[PDB]
Amino acid sequence: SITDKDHQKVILVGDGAVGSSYAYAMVLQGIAQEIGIVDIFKDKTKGDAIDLEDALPFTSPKKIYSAEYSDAKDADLVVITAGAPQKPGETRLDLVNKNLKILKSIVDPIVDSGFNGIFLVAANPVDILTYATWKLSGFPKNRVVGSGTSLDTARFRQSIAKMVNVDARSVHAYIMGEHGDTEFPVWSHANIGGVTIAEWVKAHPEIKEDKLVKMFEDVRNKAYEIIKLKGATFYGIATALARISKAILNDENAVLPLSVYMDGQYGLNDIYIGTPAVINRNGIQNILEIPLTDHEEESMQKSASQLKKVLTDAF
Amino acid sequence: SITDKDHQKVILVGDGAVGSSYAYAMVLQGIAQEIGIVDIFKDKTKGDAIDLEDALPFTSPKKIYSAEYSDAKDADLVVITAGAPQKPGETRLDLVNKNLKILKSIVDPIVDSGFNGIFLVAANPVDILTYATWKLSGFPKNRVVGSGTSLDTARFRQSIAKMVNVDARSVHAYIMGEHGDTEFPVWSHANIGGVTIAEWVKAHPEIKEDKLVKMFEDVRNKAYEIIKLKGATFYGIATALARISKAILNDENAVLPLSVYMDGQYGLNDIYIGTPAVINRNGIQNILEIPLTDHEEESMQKSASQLKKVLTDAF
Amino acid sequence: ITDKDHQKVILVGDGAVGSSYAYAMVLQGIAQEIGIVDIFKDKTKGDAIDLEDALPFTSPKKIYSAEYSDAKDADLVVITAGAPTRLDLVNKNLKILKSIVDPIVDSGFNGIFLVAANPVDILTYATWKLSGFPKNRVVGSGTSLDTARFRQSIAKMVNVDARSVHAYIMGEHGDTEFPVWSHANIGGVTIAEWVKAHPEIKEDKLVKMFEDVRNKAYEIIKLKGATFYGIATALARISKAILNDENAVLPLSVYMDGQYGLNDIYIGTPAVINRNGIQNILEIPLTDHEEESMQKSASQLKKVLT
Amino acid sequence: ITDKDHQKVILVGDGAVGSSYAYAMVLQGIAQEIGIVDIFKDKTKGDAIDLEDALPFTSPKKIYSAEYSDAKDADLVVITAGAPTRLDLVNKNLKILKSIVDPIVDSGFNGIFLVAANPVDILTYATWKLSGFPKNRVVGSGTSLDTARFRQSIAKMVNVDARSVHAYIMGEHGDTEFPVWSHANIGGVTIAEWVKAHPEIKEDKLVKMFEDVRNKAYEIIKLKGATFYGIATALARISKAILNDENAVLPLSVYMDGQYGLNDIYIGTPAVINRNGIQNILEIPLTDHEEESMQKSASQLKKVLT
C-alpha cells in the first residue's frame, strides 16, 4: 500500500536546549509522527524522550525515543543541532576545524545508514556547517538546508511589529547574509502590510532614522543579550526549525530565509549563505534574488567574502 | 529523495453537499496537500474547486481541481460519496442494484488507473457499499473502510454531552451495527469521563430511563429530522470523513467506529458492519470487540442478519 | 473575571454563506457560542443540529437557532442575509438590513458588526448609519475575498504558497475594484522585479489574471449556482482577528476620513483590526493610475449611496 | 464589549517548568498576554525576549518580564515557583507561596489560580487558605500528569493513540497515588476485558506499568536533572480548558466536600472545568481496594497539612 509512506520521521542530532526545544515544538504542533533523538549523552536523550512522551496524550501521537545514527535509514529529515562552542582564544578557523571533525562523525554514519532525505542544519556557524554537510554527505545542493537568517528575520519582524503595534505576521522584512556579525537588513523591501518602511516613516516622521538603525543593531546582538540574561538562546531557533520542518513535510512551497547554495545569485558562488528561498518536500526549489540597493549589495558581498575566505582555508 | 513521498493526495468521488463539505473541511484543517474532485457534473466540480481555492490564502496550501478517475493513480485516498437515493417504491434490493451498477463504474476505472491506496466509503447504504467496494476492487479487507456508525456515535455523544453539560470529547459512547434503522446504542460501556451511564444515573436519578431511550431514538432518527428541516444532512458526515482521513494520513492508530469486515467478531462473518476499530496509515489494524450484554448482542445479530440477507440476494 | 471568557457570535442569514461561515467557525474552534438567525426558522434549526454533530471532533460550542434578542450579549454580529451585478441587489438588501439592525440594537447588542451581504461597502455604510455604532466597530468584508483570489491566482502562476504572496485588491467590491500592482510582491520581491527575472510571464497574462479575479464570482455562479467557501473562510479569518485581538492587517470595508482624498464612505483598503474593531487604516501610496481607479470606484460608490 | 476579548496570564516561577509552559502557550496560541514573574529579573527578561522570537511563526502575544502588580487584570495566575520526595519540599515551598499570593491578591487579581508547584495538593490548599478565593477558583494540576503518563504507558503497550486510552491516577500526586484500573479502558473496552482478549499481557506487567508511572519523575530526574515537558503541556491543556470555557473533564487537585468520604482537603480526582473554574467533581465509584488507596492517600495528606 502506497499509504505506508504516510509516516514521517525525523532524526534529531544534538539534544541541547535547542534540540530539546525543537522536539517539544514538533510534539506540541503535531508535526511528524516519529522523532529519534541522537546525542553522545545517552542518558540525557532517554530523559528527554520519556519527558516528551508525557505530552502526547494532549497532542497527536508520535513514536519518540533515544536513537542511534542507524535509525536514520528511513528518516525524512535529519536535523543537526550539535556544534561545539567557540572557546576563548580559538580563531574562527579553529572553531571550524573542531566542528568539521565532529560533523564528519555524524554525517558519515548517517549516510551509511541509507538515509536518503533532507539535512536541516542549525549548529553554529550555520552557513559554514551547512556547506560542510553538503561536502561531507554528497547530497544534492537543494537537499541540504541551513536555518541561516530565519531567526534573525523573525527577530527583525517582531522588533518592527512592536514598534508599529501590528501582528508580526503582517510585517515582511529580511535579514540576509551569513548569520552572525556580518548579516544585514534589507530595508529596501521591508514593509508592513505592503507599505514599505520608507513610505511608513514618511507617514510617521516621529520614527527617526536612528531608531531604525538601533533596531537592527539590537537584532544583530540579540543572541548576546539573551545569553547575558539567561545563559543560552533556544526558543526562537527551535520554533524556526519547526517552521521549516513543517514546510518540508507538508510540501508547502513556502518562502523562508535560509542557508542556500549560491550559483551566481548576488554575484556569489560556491557558498551557502542566507537568502529568501522557496522550500517544499524536495528541499530548495527556488532561490529568490532580492534586487538590493548599492549599500545592501555591498553588505552582502562583504558577508560572503569573509565567509568564503574562511571556507577555503578550512579545506 | 524519500521526502518526495511527503505529498498527500485525496481523490473525492461525488460532489454533492457531503463531498463538497468534506473538501471544505479538509481545506480548513489543512489535511492533505491535493484534492481532486470527480463527478458526472463537470461544471459543478470546476465550480467547487475554484470556490475552495479562494480559502487557501487563509489556510495551508493545496492543489485543488476538477479531476478524472485516472488522477487516482498516485492517490493515497479515494473517498466515495456518490450514491443514488432510494426512490419511493423501490425495495432495498433495488437501491442496492442501482448503486452497484454505479459503484462498478467508479471502482473499476479507479483500480485501472493504478490506485494503490485506501478506499473510504460514505455513500448510502454505507456498510453494503463498503462490502461492494471490497468485492469490486479486490483490495484487502483492511484497506476498504466505511464511515459506518461514526456519525451516529458523534450524534450520540453530543446528545449525552448536552444533557449532562460536558464537552462531548469527554463522553465515550458507541452506536454500532448497520448504519440505519437497525443500529443500536452500547449503553453497557457508555461513559462520561470514565463513569458509566448506569453509575451516572444512580448519582443523578432526575435522569429517567425513558429520557435515555428517547435520546437514542432521536439519534437514530436524526437524519430524518434534519432532512425534514433543511433538505439534506452534510456537516456531520463531512466532519467525520475528515477525522477518518486525518487518522489515516497522520498514522494515528486512533480508535473510531467504522464499517469493517467481520471475521468472527460478535459471531459474525463476511460482512462489513459498524464497530470500534483501530485505524492508521495502512487502514484497519485491529477490530475492537466490545463485550456486549445479551440485549446488545441480540441487536447486533438482528442488524447483521437483515444486512447479510440483503448482500446475498444482491449477488 | 474569567466569566467574560465566553465568546458569542450571532449570525444573521443562513444561506450557503452563513451556513459555511458557521461550519468554518466550528471546524477551527473560533468562539464558544453561535446563534443563527433567519426568516426560515426550520432551516436554522436544521443547520444548528447538523453542525452540532461536528463538535465531538472539534472544540465545544453552544449552537442554536436564535432570535435577534439573543444578540444582547454577543461579541459579534455577522450579517450575510442578502437577496440571491452586486449593485443590482442594493434596494432589495437595504430593505432586509433595515429589519435586522434595529432589533439587534434594541436587544442591547454592544459588540462589533461584521457585514458581508452584497453590495457590501454600501450595506456597511448603511449598517453604520442605522446602528449609530462607532465607525470602527462596523466592518465590511470588502475586498478581503478578491484579495485572497488575487493572491491565490498569483500563487498558482508562480507555484508558491499563497501565504507568501502579498497583493491587494482595493476599492468597492465589485466591478470598479482594482489591483495594486505597484506594491504586490512574492516574498518581498515585487511583481515588476519578478517579471524582469521571469520574462515568460507576459504583461497581458497579468491583466487577464486580474480580469478573471474581478469576474470570479460570476464564473462560480455560472458553474455551480452560488459562491460561498471563499467568503465564509474570509469571515472566519476576520472573526478570529477580532476575537483573538490580533492587530492583523486585512483588506476591509472601512470608513474614509480623508484617506486617498476620500470622505464619508466605506470602501475597501488595508486596515489593522483587533478586539475593538478598526485601529488603523493603512493608506497605500498609489501610482497615478491606481489612485485614479480608487477615485472612480469611490465616486461611483458615493453616487449609488444617494 | 469585545474589549474583554483579551486574555492574560501571569506566570509565577520561571524555572524549566514555567518557561516550558510559556513556550507551550505561545506555540499553541493560547491567550494573548503573558507576564513572567520571578526573583531572577534578568532570567525573566531573557525568556520573554527569547519567546518573542517565536511569535512571527504563531499568533501574536504581549510577552514581558512582569511584577505581581501586573496581575490586577489577569485571567489566570499560574504558580510554578518551587525549590529544586515531593513532600520533602513542603516547608521550603510554603515560604515561597506566602510571598506570592499576598501581593497577587493585593494587586486586585480576580481570576483563577492554577497551582503546579510541589507538593501540589498541599500548596493548592495553602493557596486557597492564603488567597481567600472560592474553592472552585483554585485549581491544582494534581494527577493530570500522572494520568497522562499512565495513558501513554498503556497506549505504547497496546499500540494505540493515547487519546483513545482512558485511565486515571487519583489521590495525592506523589507516592500514595493509585491507578483506577476498575474504570480504565481503551476505546471503551476495559483493561480487564482487554487482558482477557490478549492474555500475552500478564498481570505483573500492569503492576510494573503503574509502579514505573509512580516513579517516573524520579527516573527523569536521574536521567536529565529535572522534568518539565509533561507538566508544562498539562498546564497548557488546563489553561485552554478554562480560557475557552470547555467544560472538559480532567484529573485535578480539587476541594473535597464529602466526595469519597473526604473533607477539607484538595486531592486529585476527575473534575469538570470551565471559564469559572471547577463546575463538578466527578466521583468515580471505586472498588474496595481502590477506595482504601484513596483513604490512605487522603489520610496521610491531611496529617502533613497539619
PDB file of N, CA, C and O in Angstrom, chain C residues 4-23:
ATOM      1  N   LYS C   4     -16.055  36.405  31.746  1.00  0.00           N
ATOM      2  CA  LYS C   4     -16.021  37.027  30.446  1.00  0.00           C
ATOM      3  C   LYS C   4     -15.263  36.248  29.352  1.00  0.00           C
ATOM      4  O   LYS C   4     -15.184  36.718  28.222  1.00  0.00           O
ATOM      5  N   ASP C   5     -14.691  35.089  29.653  1.00  0.00           N
ATOM      6  CA  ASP C   5     -14.017  34.299  28.615  1.00  0.00           C
ATOM      7  C   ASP C   5     -15.012  33.362  27.942  1.00  0.00           C
ATOM      8  O   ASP C   5     -14.814  32.143  27.889  1.00  0.00           O
ATOM      9  N   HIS C   6     -16.084  33.932  27.425  1.00  0.00           N
ATOM     10  CA  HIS C   6     -17.037  33.182  26.651  1.00  0.00           C
ATOM     11  C   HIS C   6     -17.380  34.057  25.471  1.00  0.00           C
ATOM     12  O   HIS C   6     -17.934  35.122  25.642  1.00  0.00           O
ATOM     13  N   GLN C   7     -17.048  33.615  24.271  1.00  0.00           N
ATOM     14  CA  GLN C   7     -17.255  34.412  23.086  1.00  0.00           C
ATOM     15  C   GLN C   7     -18.454  33.956  22.280  1.00  0.00           C
ATOM     16  O   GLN C   7     -18.652  32.752  22.020  1.00  0.00           O
ATOM     17  N   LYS C   8     -19.246  34.938  21.857  1.00  0.00           N
ATOM     18  CA  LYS C   8     -20.542  34.669  21.275  1.00  0.00           C
ATOM     19  C   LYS C   8     -20.732  35.412  19.950  1.00  0.00           C
ATOM     20  O   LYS C   8     -20.547  36.622  19.854  1.00  0.00           O
ATOM     21  N   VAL C   9     -21.151  34.680  18.946  1.00  0.00           N
ATOM     22  CA  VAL C   9     -21.413  35.259  17.655  1.00  0.00           C
ATOM     23  C   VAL C   9     -22.873  35.021  17.301  1.00  0.00           C
ATOM     24  O   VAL C   9     -23.373  33.894  17.422  1.00  0.00           O
ATOM     25  N   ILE C  10     -23.549  36.078  16.865  1.00  0.00           N
ATOM     26  CA  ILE C  10     -24.872  35.952  16.271  1.00  0.00           C
ATOM     27  C   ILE C  10     -24.698  36.121  14.775  1.00  0.00           C
ATOM     28  O   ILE C  10     -24.170  37.123  14.304  1.00  0.00           O
ATOM     29  N   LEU C  11     -25.128  35.110  14.043  1.00  0.00           N
ATOM     30  CA  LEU C  11     -25.038  35.095  12.612  1.00  0.00           C
ATOM     31  C   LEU C  11     -26.421  35.347  12.074  1.00  0.00           C
ATOM     32  O   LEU C  11     -27.372  34.648  12.419  1.00  0.00           O
ATOM     33  N   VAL C  12     -26.545  36.349  11.217  1.00  0.00           N
ATOM     34  CA  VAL C  12     -27.839  36.678  10.622  1.00  0.00           C
ATOM     35  C   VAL C  12     -27.794  36.346   9.162  1.00  0.00           C
ATOM     36  O   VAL C  12     -26.982  36.918   8.421  1.00  0.00           O
ATOM     37  N   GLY C  13     -28.659  35.422   8.745  1.00  0.00           N
ATOM     38  CA  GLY C  13     -28.634  34.932   7.364  1.00  0.00           C
ATOM     39  C   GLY C  13     -28.022  33.546   7.289  1.00  0.00           C
ATOM     40  O   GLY C  13     -26.837  33.357   7.548  1.00  0.00           O
ATOM     41  N   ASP C  14     -28.854  32.571   6.952  1.00  0.00           N
ATOM     42  CA  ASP C  14     -28.431  31.185   6.942  1.00  0.00           C
ATOM     43  C   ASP C  14     -28.510  30.603   5.557  1.00  0.00           C
ATOM     44  O   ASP C  14     -28.922  29.462   5.373  1.00  0.00           O
ATOM     45  N   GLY C  15     -28.069  31.373   4.581  1.00  0.00           N
ATOM     46  CA  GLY C  15     -27.887  30.825   3.251  1.00  0.00           C
ATOM     47  C   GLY C  15     -26.636  29.972   3.215  1.00  0.00           C
ATOM     48  O   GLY C  15     -26.077  29.619   4.237  1.00  0.00           O
ATOM     49  N   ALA C  16     -26.125  29.734   2.031  1.00  0.00           N
ATOM     50  CA  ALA C  16     -24.904  28.986   1.889  1.00  0.00           C
ATOM     51  C   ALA C  16     -23.715  29.689   2.567  1.00  0.00           C
ATOM     52  O   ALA C  16     -22.874  29.034   3.216  1.00  0.00           O
ATOM     53  N   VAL C  17     -23.631  31.006   2.418  1.00  0.00           N
ATOM     54  CA  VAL C  17     -22.532  31.745   3.024  1.00  0.00           C
ATOM     55  C   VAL C  17     -22.551  31.609   4.547  1.00  0.00           C
ATOM     56  O   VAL C  17     -21.567  31.273   5.160  1.00  0.00           O
ATOM     57  N   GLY C  18     -23.670  31.954   5.151  1.00  0.00           N
ATOM     58  CA  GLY C  18     -23.760  31.968   6.610  1.00  0.00           C
ATOM     59  C   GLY C  18     -23.545  30.587   7.166  1.00  0.00           C
ATOM     60  O   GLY C  18     -22.825  30.387   8.140  1.00  0.00           O
ATOM     61  N   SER C  19     -24.157  29.617   6.509  1.00  0.00           N
ATOM     62  CA  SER C  19     -24.026  28.219   6.935  1.00  0.00           C
ATOM     63  C   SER C  19     -22.558  27.763   6.877  1.00  0.00           C
ATOM     64  O   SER C  19     -22.078  27.140   7.791  1.00  0.00           O
ATOM     65  N   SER C  20     -21.865  28.095   5.793  1.00  0.00           N
ATOM     66  CA  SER C  20     -20.457  27.775   5.630  1.00  0.00           C
ATOM     67  C   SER C  20     -19.580  28.503   6.608  1.00  0.00           C
ATOM     68  O   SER C  20     -18.546  27.980   7.052  1.00  0.00           O
ATOM     69  N   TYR C  21     -19.951  29.737   6.904  1.00  0.00           N
ATOM     70  CA  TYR C  21     -19.208  30.507   7.888  1.00  0.00           C
ATOM     71  C   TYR C  21     -19.302  29.801   9.237  1.00  0.00           C
ATOM     72  O   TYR C  21     -18.310  29.680   9.959  1.00  0.00           O
ATOM     73  N   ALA C  22     -20.497  29.341   9.564  1.00  0.00           N
ATOM     74  CA  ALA C  22     -20.702  28.677  10.831  1.00  0.00           C
ATOM     75  C   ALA C  22     -19.857  27.416  10.901  1.00  0.00           C
ATOM     76  O   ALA C  22     -19.258  27.120  11.918  1.00  0.00           O
ATOM     77  N   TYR C  23     -19.834  26.673   9.812  1.00  0.00           N
ATOM     78  CA  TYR C  23     -19.067  25.461   9.765  1.00  0.00           C
ATOM     79  C   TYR C  23     -17.601  25.791   9.949  1.00  0.00           C
ATOM     80  O   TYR C  23     -16.876  25.091  10.668  1.00  0.00           O
TER      81      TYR C  23
END
